[PDB]
Amino acid sequence: CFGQCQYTAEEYQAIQKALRQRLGPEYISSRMAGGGQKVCYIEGHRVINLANEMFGYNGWAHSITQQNVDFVDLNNGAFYVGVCAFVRVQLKDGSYHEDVGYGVSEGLASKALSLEKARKEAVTDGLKRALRSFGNALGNCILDKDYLRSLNKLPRQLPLEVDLTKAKRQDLEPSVEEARYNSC
């Protein structure tokens, strides 16, 4: 089962070499730091899909070790909330990485909205920072300044077009139902 199954030679080598890869502009995005300059990041769903491909839908697993709200302050109608989380990612072989993530909500005037934003942002950031420690392909290269410089030296491509023809349109999945009924 999970945590017990050991990696085969082919799977190991494939995952290792694929994890030494770096990401292309189709993954990186850009924000405007406060007082700073253009910073580069990788969106959450991007890292989630990257993990689900590298390891499988059941090859990796994450958990919230602890989430703690640091502070909640109120300045003339604005709610400032700081929240941190500790996400631990674990592979089916037993290997594991754990790291912190933070969430920040300074502008809003609704306490519930600020907390909703902060906690989810903290958990997502922690998941990103914990998946980082597996290899460049999972976000370890986003902190390599030379990698960023070489990313600036690439054509700034337009957003990719998503084809919604073969999108999921009904509940039943006979392809899965068949294999699972035969799985007993």
Binding to DNA, residues 104-123 (CB under 7 A): 113, 116-117, 120-121, 123
Cβ at position 164, least distance to DNA in Å: 18
- The CB-of-182 to DNA minimum distance in angstroms stands at 33
Q: Which range, of 37-45, 69-77, 80-88, 172-180, touches DNA by CB under 7 A?
A: 37-45
* 42 in contact with DNA (CB under 7 A): yes
Among 1, 9, 33, 167, binds DNA (CB under 7 A): 33
Closest CA to 27 of 2, 8, 14, 44: 44
Single-letter code of the amino acid located at 8: T
Quote the tokens at residue 183: 């799985």
AA letter at 28: I
Distance, CA of 51 to CA of 53 (rounded, Å): 5
79 binds, among DNA, a second copy, none (CB under 5 to 8 A by kind): none
Cα–Cα distance measured from residue 51 to residue 130, given in angstroms and rounded to the nearest whole number: 11
Told to check if 101 binds DNA by CB under 7 A, we report yes
Characterise 19 by phi-psi region: left (phi > 0), alpha (psi -120 to 50), beta (else): alpha
**Which parts of this chain interact with DNA (CB under 7 A)?**
29-34, 36, 39-45, 47, 101-103, 113, 116-117, 120-121, 123-125, 128-129, 142-143
